[PDB]
RNA sequence: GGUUGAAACACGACCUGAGAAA
């Protein structure tokens, strides 16, 4: 199956360097143009660079010319994006895209990778503190209860929150992270469950912040009052 | 001077079966080297239309593109529940390639009132010196809503953050969380902590409140 | 320039053209 796999992303200091890789499978990159397209968090796609199949000619967006270098290793079936003099404006999810075959898809990008997240900041990595959002209602209120976990003060994105080790997926709402004034991210993950489930069902929120290598499981229980 | 792609509208809410049209105007001649893409939240874009009007293999025939000089249109004949995403146009006539700003297509449904919940800060967090009061608005439509924090009838401003989810895949509703952040010294100087919510689906503002230590 | 060769430029072929057109 034709696929592109990006790698090499992560947290890097402004002015530092980072080399992104794009491993291709199911096809050979030597017969296609390979493009890099990025997407800052919450914005649109922005073309970055491309390399031509047979001449090796490279093209760059005006915002990255001179700082970025795209290349392809046909023996490794992998494209690269050498990024230097990185700025906060370069913080984005970086996709590598195959330009399709001319007769079959013109110049459209027919195959995209999953993308790799590049975060350019001088902020240090920080694991999140997880606090419980205890449900107010009782086990016999007869309604629907709401409980959650507060994932607070972490950097950088992303963090993952599951409930009962992924077994609880209905009614769960994991809000997007919001950047606080302190520069650390914070979000809440809530879930609505039947009030009759309190006691018969246990609720564990599983918070995984891979950049800081933090795994925290917090038990959300009805408050003792 | 490189080419610009002005995409309009930036967003639109439409129902299933509607006929939606997304337009892109190139600042200069791009011939027909225009492509249209569909991107689901958190996922990679997918090719829909290439060469302005040609349908990419595997894409259903309800998607169609057309060229009128420098005007390019993406048309979904009958909107399907899986067609709701962000759509981008791209010119590949000359380098540097440029994308349109995008158009997020969201499903329009009936108005739903938010279920409001208030959560006091856990005992563990004040031990850390910070208090976070969270107010939850669950499953409402439309997304617009007014969330106000009042402590001892005093309005708060500049110390709370809002976060809204994407449109839910099942009931097509939104959820909102408002988090009032205070220090322990500022949290204990007050008594009543109220969350006032105003939404068009409500006849009047709803208020969920609590007191420090009130169970 | 266009079309194509897994191919926007470079390269090969083809087409138009006085000339692929510095």
Author numbering:
A (entry chain H): 4 to 228
B (entry chain L): 1 to 215
Article passage:
To accomplish this, we designed an RNA construct that consists of two loops connected by a five base-pair duplex region. Close examination of the backbone and nucleobase arrangements of the first five nucleotides of the overhang sequence (5′-UGAGA-3′) revealed that both structures bear a strong resemblance to the T-loop architecture, a ubiquitous motif that frequently mediates tertiary interactions within noncoding RNAs, including the T-loop of tRNA.
To our surprise, iterative rounds of model building and refinement revealed positive density corresponding to the glycine linker between the 5′-end of the P1 stem (G1) and the 2′-OH of the penultimate residue of the 5′-UGAGAAA-3′ sequence (i.e., A21 of the crystallization construct). As a result, the 3′-terminal A22 of the overhang sequence protrudes from the structure of the closed dumbbell-shaped ligated RNA. The 5′-P to 2′-hydroxyl ligated product is a unique RNA branching reaction, mediated by glycine, which leaves the 3′-terminus available as a handle for subsequent binding events and reactions. The backbone then makes an abrupt turn at A20, reversing direction and allowing A21 to be sandwiched into this pocket. The crystal structure of the ligated product also provides a potential explanation for the increased stability of the aminoacyl ester linkage, because the folded structure restricts the solvent-accessible surface area of the ester by 90%, which would not occur in duplex or unstructured strands.
